[model samples]
Target chain A: NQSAIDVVAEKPSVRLTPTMMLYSGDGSHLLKSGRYLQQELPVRIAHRIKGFRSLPFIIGCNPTILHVHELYIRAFQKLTDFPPIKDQADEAQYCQLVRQLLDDHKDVVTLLAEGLRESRKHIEDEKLVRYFLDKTLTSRLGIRMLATHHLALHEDKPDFVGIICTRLSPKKIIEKWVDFARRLCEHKYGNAPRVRINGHVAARFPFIPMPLDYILPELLKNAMRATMESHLDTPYNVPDVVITIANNDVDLIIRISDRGGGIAHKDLDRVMDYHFTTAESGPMHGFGFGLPTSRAYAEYLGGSLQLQSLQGIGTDVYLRLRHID
Target chain B: NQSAIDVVAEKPSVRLTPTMMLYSGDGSHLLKSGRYLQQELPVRIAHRIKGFRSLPFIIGCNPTILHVHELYIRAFQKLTDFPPIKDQADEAQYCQLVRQLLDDHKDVVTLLAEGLRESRKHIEDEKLVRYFLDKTLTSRLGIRMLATHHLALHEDKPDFVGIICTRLSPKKIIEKWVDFARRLCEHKYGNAPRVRINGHVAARFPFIPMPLDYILPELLKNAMRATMESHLDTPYNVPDVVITIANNDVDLIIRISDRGGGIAHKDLDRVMDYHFTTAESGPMHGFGFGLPTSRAYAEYLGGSLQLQSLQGIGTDVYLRLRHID
Candidate 1:
């Protein structure tokens, strides 16, 4: 018979040290990994998941087995490694590599599902099974990111990712917002919205655009919704949210004031909480991701959101973002 | 000359389509790779890096030379294609792979640095050179993350990672905290400092301990510093920093009140700002990563940090963590 999985013991193939273990940032990386493996573990990952939980278990663990698994020999058609995107010289090979990888992912998903069911006995606990699932998915996910990022770069549409900040225009971005807000308002309320940008808004400034893209939309949406709802009881001349942008030497402030009836004290604290959307639109409501996601986006770039409300008057939301040199 | 890197024009060994180019959340992986191909990427990658300018140059376009680059030799190292950690059998092989990969990275780094200098004719801008530097470092950093995480898993010392939340003992963690804090205080102040825990500190409750390990030490350090400094003017009464843990069902509130002199009004806004540390320790001062990192650790698990300072008096720090299921 072909070598049983037990061949690993005789060969002792993988040499591991504790330092090589997975950890958060600054945790031990690779040096001195074998020093002392934590004897008491929350999960006995290595000991438990080894060997044949099932024939499919072997297949899941060792993808190479797919070639000989008889039933899964067809999977080779899809389980392909992507070729590098060096230049147009190998463009044909690169395109096929991506195509085959993507196509094969569909089959692998089905295969993994089948393997999990078949190898149920191999997984010691339900948690470990889920753990296995996450590992499988993440591995696939990493591949997707590489391929997609490559494509984005190829298409000349690279993502805005930088640890260092750059100066982008807020005033220009505001103008873009005005057009977008008008469209959104018209789509929501029959009439287009009037968004008032303060005359003092900085014409140009420095900041990463990714975070602004996230923050500006959320605040504007909130302001738009407030104005739209409050105007229903009042005359059509109801003013839109007044957005004032100011650039201090060290900080950039954007104050958005809305005449929409203010939030109750109970809900005021939670306005920026995840899953705390106040949208009433039927089927047009949010998935409760916007506010917290926006806040997270802001915080990721060293920014904060502050809100003040008057019981029956209005609400002022101040967004403070730091200008990093 | 072996094909002169132009054999790609003769007949492309790899085929690729634009659509299959880049993606996220899903992709292909490899169980076995060109064990010899590690020698290939440093030169190709370095050569490609030579021709960029300060302006955003698109990267998604080129990905070939897979033999001279084929089937993604770099892709396997990065796509990482982490298979399931079944047991010790694959462990030896996996460990060796990581070791070889990390070792090869050194050569790649040196090669890229040399390439940056060698390809001086191709680069049009200096900023782009720095940009290339950041990208190279980040790519290496990403490799570190992958290697460490895998090692963590292999050793079964899984990091305290969670999205929903788990039931861990805050009280026990605090007891552990007290010991750690006492040691820190005794070493710094030459005597054990008293830290009063609020009666409401969870007798035993569910929470992620890893973040607490990061967050608690910071707050405790600040509190101890304040207490030590404030009491120094007087007879060393050194009142203990009162740490009150109040769980309001929806919110897990941790209030750390200290007698230390409060922050100035101008700096109050930036107490939580990254790289803004008030520590006066010589050479031991903050790289400014502490509070922000702790805040991130908290926020990553649905938590936040709030600071309130009574100038010239004392400061109170509140930590809010969600009881996510």
Candidate 2:
């Protein structure tokens, strides 16, 4: 007689603080973390279901949005209906369920973006859409981080505390992404801006690389596009995109500077908004979800991504990641 | 029969939000702002006195700290005891009191730093000192900002909304500070690094220049010193300290990048702390209040000052001022 959403939503979520994720690399606190996640994950999923249910009826009924909503509800039911985890064997089984859930929801971000775009006419206020998406995405990021961190504990690695790499090198990450982005840029525009990696080229620190994996490339692509497009008439004159990394005890700071013509003053604020694209429609030129989603991931773990641009000069994107250690 | 501290301490402070200070450049809101300050300033001054009283007895008793506390108490009395400001003429008189109060408290920052340093040995926890200083200084900053903004409203100026410059040009500011800092560098180090002002030189935006006036000089001094000292052996080959001004709709971003060798990882965290100095003691080399205090001013108005350094390569100080227009 009881509605499933009502039953699941009534269960209060155990909020996960950043300190709760501070685990020693030796897996000493694995069992405790595993237990916490077991209880926390189901509650988090249930809350997301409630959030989706509360959205405007017209928007919520969109096929893409409904698919994601149903996915969360199903995941919540699967998690809550499961047997309690009492041992490592039970935890392993629970992890499998979580992994499957993660796999199923891999397209959730794109789906949500697509749904909102399709239902744009129904959205009374864009700010509300942004608020909802931000909340959902940030929550989803935290849930994934917990599950991934727990799963990462099972794998042994040098200088790693769960999913956080103790000796994460910004230079290596930048170089890797620069190479990937350069090729993609060249493939699309027939030219890519030269990127010079500078500053603390050898500096390493503690950080989660998953977000960076998305953020770095997205930023690099933007920088590359801006650089190449601005100098289309003089391909040889395209200035370098300088990437600087500075690692300290408190934060790992990365600055990506480009000599591409910067964003217009009128367009600067909207650059971070969803679907605020200046690019001709293509996969290479983002659907405009890159910056906002990347920012969501960065902010999920108490980090920040900021964009600074000059109209005729170039742009600088500063990404600051606070060291959890 | 009531003690002044007890009587004033109970008076609640009127918190100033950024939105509250958003004036329309014209003198339309002058009377309203003037009236608001009449009530709010005394309460804020009283809170500062209460804060000073709450400090450790030994620290509070220090001559320098006691001097500041007495100044606040006097200012609070002068403000609260003043007759009601019902007219513009009364507001004019009130401005005189405020200007005098500001003049009296000009050395408050230096006095607080000196007091804390003098009482360093008696301090059980450094964090407590930082917390207290941050709270006290931030309050002082907001108080000054309100008073200054109110005062500036009286003087009619084009493109100015109170103390905020609607057309604040970062290039002009940077160039002015560079010349000043370069002269100081040459006088102290016998040489100064070349400074190249780049990016949007013509970009102008709405901003409060008071904090920038302090923050820019402090940051430029550090960059100049680092650049000169790093190239002491190769003075002729000294690299340029590049200053980039990026103005967007939401923020005025200035990046001061030096080719000076960056700070060591061990010393990075302590650089922002009071009394952290790497140079042989001199006026040119800061007492280490520069970074922290500058940061305080920037953050008071919802802006930020951040440092990113590479041990051997260089250091980049990013100052982001959020536009309030």
Candidate 3:
């Protein structure tokens, strides 16, 4: 098994730039993509396994980290041991194996976050942990996107090239999250801030909604918490959390602005740290992974998450995602 | 006079970082600031003259360019020849001289834009011109701010550290520009888009208002134009342009979003170029310096202006100004 891992790891993973993923419906493009994935997926998995092994012995020994490491090794073995895809029949079967691997790794991020938290005392430099987690998660996001995109292509949805939506409506996705965030706020504080959705209400563009799926909810939840808390005396009259979506040729930019008392100047930089949290420990708060994880997803696809706040006013989170279709 | 310019140019300008400009009401801080400005202003002026001198001869020969070069040389002479500022009496005199130099350079941006336009055919490499212009204008902004701030210190307004407003109201500034832009839009296109101001309406922070004075109006004008033109058939029922302000500890961010049919992808990259306007040549339109010039001012004090546009949807302009106090 060790020798097999080494062989697959020696095979370089095919790095896919955004331009390389440009959608084409032709048979040649589809076949080429399938072939690329068949070769690339196992190599990526093996490399990640190699990364886990190279970590400090103590970090790797953590139960959560070790379990995640084992998961990668198993995935690498299964993928490399599979037969090559030469036709449609073989491609479909390979996709099934990939889908199963994706399902197995669903809890990877949570596990990593927990493992790092538990090993905090063992870590000499937090930057080293941050750097390692960033690379591992970023690579994971890219690998999953490729596999999922290939899987999505089989569905043959109109206006979709793989997982990318040619006419993705940001407003629709935001509304979905806003409702969820409102519900969460109501459950927690017995009240929720109203969200006013405005600006390019009908705007649509080419993008993958998955990253925003993770990012928007976190930002909206934060905005709602701030708004509701700031107006505790009159929760019913809390200022609206305003969201504006601008669809540009190069990017889809969303602004989430709320009038919740803004973060203090001292805590601004630490807001993105994995261990930092302002909320009391509970199911609804205190994980502190919402921001950094969301940011990692945003940046994985050539986008960014930025926050601006006033000490006693509110906070604004800008999410910019590059057009990937 | 040539030797005088050379001698001053040889003296390095004392570069003031944001930390160096931290406000203090103490007498020593005031005296030190006064001394630094006196020495730094002439050196900065001299360096700009050198920049102009280094420009390609053919491009520099343009009438407007030559005129601007002459203005800088004259300002350098006046400033460097001023007597040493040793006490309050001499400092007051030096400030008056600096103010005159500031007034003298007020029209430099317009002149440079015009000069470059006239010399466009002779410019073999536009990047060279862009680099030279960026350096010259950025230096000019810094010199003027230092002088203006020193002068404002004498006024000693409450919450005013020089020209930096500790409680600068972005809503007030946005309202002022929205009115001007609406009037301009009505005058030119017979209609103006309604503007809805939202998010952190009461937010205030430490920042200089001068750059916003230039950037906000230009952005509002563009948004108004896009809104008016996109709905030409129903000009009376134009959509509203939305302005949101978020004040943070590190920076003040303002987002101006408009439902003016967005810019095409092809033109997106060129929008910030000095001569890339889509409007017809007129007093209100067509001198493509609005975005680039506004961006220069925004970036001068460690801030940024970013544009996001979607073809057939709308555009969003994000203006971020670093807190200078």
Candidate 4:
């Protein structure tokens, strides 16, 4: 532990020569050299895990993943011989290569999951379970990085078709969707809930847009339902799904409030359950993929998702995303 | 310069305790702690570049990428708060969140590409150009890694949908893909070259399969063209994309030999050109995203792409991918 602190305290000190630093103009050589250096990282890591005798669960997955690591190395071994891309067609072909590798990744993931599952069965220690989880997640992360790194370096356009770890505009997105919801109400159902946006930041927030979109719609649906139910028959006068978005110094906040009859205190804990939904009173219920998933997306990116309800009055959701990381 | 060597030579020494080693059971907390620690990494890197007095041009892109890095961090900082999936619907929603993030990644990619492009202009020094390329590529790689890392740990399933840096069967993939190519040839036209696979390893090899698959077809096209063009009218005798695969102790080897009209000495260097295709006699040419991109893919993963032509005798291609880092 002391040594770990010491290592961090001692800042890395190194020197580089001007010539040794220069890479081939095309960037191919740099990539080549980088790949060469990194190819063995997983091998070393896989082999090194044997030393950690205390974490048997973590090491359970190593042998399989290590084998996976070896196979992947051999598969792309021919990559170093490929020439620079010459046109759009070649670029497409290159993308196909990345795609092919990705398709096969499931085999490895299955192996990892199996190992993790097996490890959990025999172990009762929370600490070991946590250790293995960390190690496996990190190991999985390393493979993912290696899998996609080269394509970004060499492919013509970014593979936006694939999942990208990216930051995005949550406020703009929320407003856009809210507008869509209103449009749907007017155009499709002719009974739109009023929607209001406040403190919407011009700045975009960070997130994988799809999940947030998924999460947002669910939250909005719930809000819209509550408003409609509480103000039943007077639907036209029902309050809007008031989504107030703001980025404080430490966090990005989005508060979705509704005037629907709030949940009874007894059901608050169960609201996020898979099959739980109070929207069953009308057409906005069932297929309950909303709150649970939204909360998952919220916290998946290192934020908090919570709900505050005043029985028979309304439900206010406090979603806080850490902005500072 | 000596100091740099000293740093690299200095082995990392650290200690850990059993308790300290374990992460919180919640992957979200781990991500939170990780983000908290790494959020400053690029900032520190960006600032430290100011100390290097030798390469002004190289440091030019650092500031922009630094900004890019900061924005990306702030964008995804909220991911640590996602809850675990409670059901199928929840999983679907969670996937939507991930998909959303990936879709928005293009914004980040655009920023990075723009920064790289802006830095490339007005740089005349070869050293500076090369240095920036290295720095940019490496930095881009780092961000890509971080972007996807947390999602795998937090999302319902690991992000295993793309090319994984993994250990795989190179020969196996080649044969599998070659069979595909052969079937394609047979069905598309009427005649197909008979592919012969040799020296297949009992053990699987390592590589990214898809790009390699793309590359193999291109090489096979060239080979088939050579054999058919040479034995034209003697169509019954043209050989297949004969792949002689083997694993040398330190490297994986694939010898793709074709009995085609060999390249004239003058045209050998030009064969890898983007639009330069001599195989226009059939449907194998045009939309040239072939050899050049193939070469890029090869080197991107730390390997070499080379052609050995014996003039009119034939073209013997030697592809080598390092088995070890």
Candidate 5:
């Protein structure tokens, strides 16, 4: 920190002392400096977390870095590279990636750190983590996961194969799984609010720079859907969807509970798997893409998505992430 | 000089290497180099020359250092609140200053070195220095100077004035002054070659960051006038106006010799003064601003000018500047 200001003998020092030295030029005497050396740095590991994260190997998204660190991964992706070109999809994706790259390039990298900075002020505030998670996950990789089991069998929507991980009450696992799950899930749809979340984490939102916002976008989307489905369709059925968060020493946990009918025992495995749906008809209801996508996005953000079901009653989903201060 | 780099780092190291690392992150890597703090010396100063030869106050011009320590100069420019903006011109000067500050922001303040690392090749490149100086000077003060100078004068035709410097040689000076003097002196009813030049130090160039195109633009206008006057005169007469250049280690000089009559004694001192001109007959020869302005630009770029004239023999204009390497 001190180096930027040098005892520049050649380049005169700034008159920070406020007294002008008598000189030949003028009241504001000025002399241009010459010290502009080019520099070099050795490759030694730094102990600081911020410094450690800046290592080139961690920047796998960059082509040069990826080539150096993951040659095998590069080859695997190249195998799928073909072209008549899906120009439309490619352009849209390009636009999205570019915007994300420009808008939150720094935020995306230090999201966990940023989350910690922000949430530190409000230990009770779980919205902080939700925002961080949303920022980190910029794609749609989740919807397919929710109903993976049943849809993987039917092969109706061949492109829509599900991949989901559901565990109940597992304490040892950190929220990184949940972050991974949420990131894997939030890929379901656009930024439409789906679920309304209201639960709270225990208290301390551990994790220095935690993935806070990972689940909120998806959960909010679910909440939005629940508001639509419960209000418009049923008679005398005022279905409520609420979001809850639990901050603990280990990590942050969020719960999005919907007062919609739980899966039927027969359909429990099938409904959450891939193809089954609670709604009678329409493209929006039967496809069942939202649930899985939200779960996946959560997982991707280093968090987990746990589903609790009561047949013919209601549904509660919990997503957790790792937190170490 | 060395301590600056060590200051930026939390950990100070006595061992320094001859290499440098370039990093784009928060601009941290820059703060850790010690050698980046070497000071520079100013051997040449360019000023736009004007007024009676005895006294001159430069309006504004780019400083042309023979061997500029670019890194040191850049660092000197980066000092927070160092260059006191006492007036509007300095305020305009600060717009570019802000950019340098943003490039070296406070995030990497801890490891901030006094000077930036610049390649020796880059520092040694005269063209780059000229280009940068030209660009910087014109962008700040020259635009306003040109606009004001042109607007204030009433013009029936596009009149221009430019100042330049070359080698100091008696033959070259006589050759140039004789031509301008002969043309103006030989013409009947006044309206011959109306070129007037001042022998003075250069002050500034309005359009710079040369390869400055504006310099050519101004010079071309004068040439066009000389060409047109030739076409209008008698068929027996061939235009015999030419400009010559000569250089010596003592000083580099430029001579613009024209076939015009010498200046009257009363008007000799007024040639480069603001709004002074000898052409009373046709549309007021020049905007009457260029003579002084171009001189100021030349002087500021480390050069000076001198003129020689006679009643009828001819006139010659001379400009001299320190050699640049």
Candidate 6:
């Protein structure tokens, strides 16, 4: 005989609140999420939401400060597909709704408070303040954290600054850089094209007491990434963009270059100019600081940045430095 | 009693190929490496000097190829570094030495190859091409993979383009981005910051994309990291940024404003004008294309990018878009 289970009413949990859920399997990952789950949301998330009672309570309300009083506790977590940035036109629709929500909520809360003082109506001031505070803190910290994440995972800096700036042992640099190149290949080309390497010297590192491999890899990574994205046809490409290395006891004569719909020459000078980048600095993306940092670091360390790209050939980057004795 | 270990011989073997190593830790990912063994370098990755093997190979040379073959491999690898574009000050010094080495090695290889029969030489030619093919594959793939990784991990792009470019979904991107971000924070910041969420909108998936709650945390991270290395206080000294929201049913207007040292108006225009970012676009840093990409995406979706920054005050970014309904 089939009996109806008294579906236990679990306390409504806060979605995205880092609820100690250990989900396994790819299907499970997709199947278990909800509206509060946002990114991590899929058809499955809805099932999980039904499993938790708090999910309903939290989803129905805009988070109040009381909802996330614990600073360390993650108030939300979501995983989603990344649709390339579409026209931001959708944002225009959101502005009106968000502003309205903000004002209406505040007004309703305000009226309730006023009425409570004179006519016995109760208002939740503590809850409102907390929401505002928590929201503010979250936005501020999230932006900073993301920016930092972008910077560290930048893929370009380590190769340029860590390896090239420090000018560590050349042998070490080549080994690491080549390995990076090889890994990149396995991902992009699959199994079709064959890859090989030849004639690599530790290529002398600069005497600057910095990493030789790090900086070059950063630059090479940048060049290669740019080239590949330009719609080139090479199933396999060496770290041969506009990058260059000098074989000597003195400074190097490196020209890092990249081809495939290269940038205009007039823009080349502008590209390196730090002042030119500041304009585009935004909260969601870069603050327009990575370039100046690189240039400043180079100039400070007694190095230089020069660019040369023929209209159709490719863009080359030249990083010159003093060779180690 | 434990026996004394040889540090020198074992230390080198500890180095393993990066792709081969699995990442495991929130902060410092320990590479699954072990006892250092002096294995010969891969044939494709050895120096090419005459009696080069007789010389101490900083690292092991691949035992497969002879000294002559090692020469070519070394040269090509060196070219990967692109030495010619280094600072002009060190140009003469490096060029003379490189020319000398090429003459010594290339001359010898030329002579040796001359003695070989045409058929045999042709076989060698095929081998070299195969090697180049491998390199080409790596280069191209490396670029796409890195960019895709960056974009996937990017905060704004979740669900922006899921898997179409890299076939990675929002869930995968979030997990990887989170993991990647965590690793990066650990490496750069010692540990992740206390993340706080400002919004309680996780339930609004596919409708209103949720914003990361702890932006300032990331900003502080960057500030701390950059200053830690450069002795400069950035994210910290930078003032609290804000987001402005104004919605009108059919569209929305959301703005992110920052109070960092402001940029010039022309720079702001440059930000609007794609490829204007100096650091984010230049070699080993930015592709000078992020802003453009964002704008293009927005425009494509019928939205637009707007900016306002006061040189001494702060900067504001307005992203306007249409409503989902």
Best by DockQ: 3
**Can you write out model 5's per-residue Cα lDDT over A1-325, one digit (the tens) per residue?**
1122112212321211101111111111211100010000000101111221333332323443333223222322332232222334543443343233234323222333333433344434344333433322322112112112222322333222211122122222223344443443345422222333332322432121212333444444444444344344443345445555554344455555554444444655554332235544101112453454455455665566666543223445666565423
Error of 5 at A288 (Å): 99
Backbone clashes counted, model 6: 164
* lDDT, candidate 6, B142-204, per-residue tens: 222222322232234433431122121223323333454446655754544232211111212
- How much lDDT does each candidate structure score? 0.49, 0.77, 0.77, 0.51, 0.34, 0.34
Candidate number achieving the greatest TM-score relative to the actual structure: 3
What CAPRI grade goes to candidate 2? incorrect
**lDDT, candidate 2, A87-131, per-residue tens:** 678877887888887776577777788889899999988787778
Candidate 5: where is the Cα deviation over 4 Å?
A1-325, B1-232, B235-238, B278-286
lDDT of each residue in A1-325, candidate 1, tens digit only: 2232233213322322212221210213211221111111101222222422433444455443342233222322222222333435454465454555455444453454455555556655555544444344333433343343333323322222221123466677767877787687777777645777763455454344545655687678777777777677554566667776665455566767676665665787666543456776100125444555555445544666766553334556767676654
TM-score of each: 0.33, 0.62, 0.76, 0.32, 0.21, 0.22
After superposition on all C-alphas, the RMSD of every candidate to the true structure, in Å, is 29.8, 9.2, 5.9, 33.2, 33.4, 32.0
Evaluation by DockQ, superior candidate among 2 and 6: 2
State the weakest 10-residue window (summed lDDT) of model 6 chain B.
B30-39
Ranking by DockQ: 3, 2, 1, 6, 4, 5
Candidate no. 3 TM-score: 0.76
Per-residue lDDT of B1-325 in model 4, one digit per residue for the tens?
Answer: 2232233222332222212322232435654534432343334333223323234545444676666655544433333234544444554454465455445554543454455456655555545433443344333333333334434435343222223333577666777777766676566445667878665445354333544655677777667656666675866656666666655444565767665656775676666654456644111123443565566556655676776543434555656565533
lDDT of 4 at B305: 73
Residue-level error in angstroms, candidate 1, position B153 = 6.2
Clashes of each: 52, 0, 4, 70, 181, 164
Tell me the lDDT of model 1 at A71: 28
Q: Which portions of model 4 show Cα errors greater than 4 Å?
A: A1-325, B1-167, B205-214, B225-232, B279-286
Query: What DockQ was computed for model 1?
Result: 0.01
> Which residue pairs in candidate 2 have backbone atoms (N, alpha carbon, C) closer than 3 angstroms, thus clashing?
none
lDDT of 2 at A322: 76
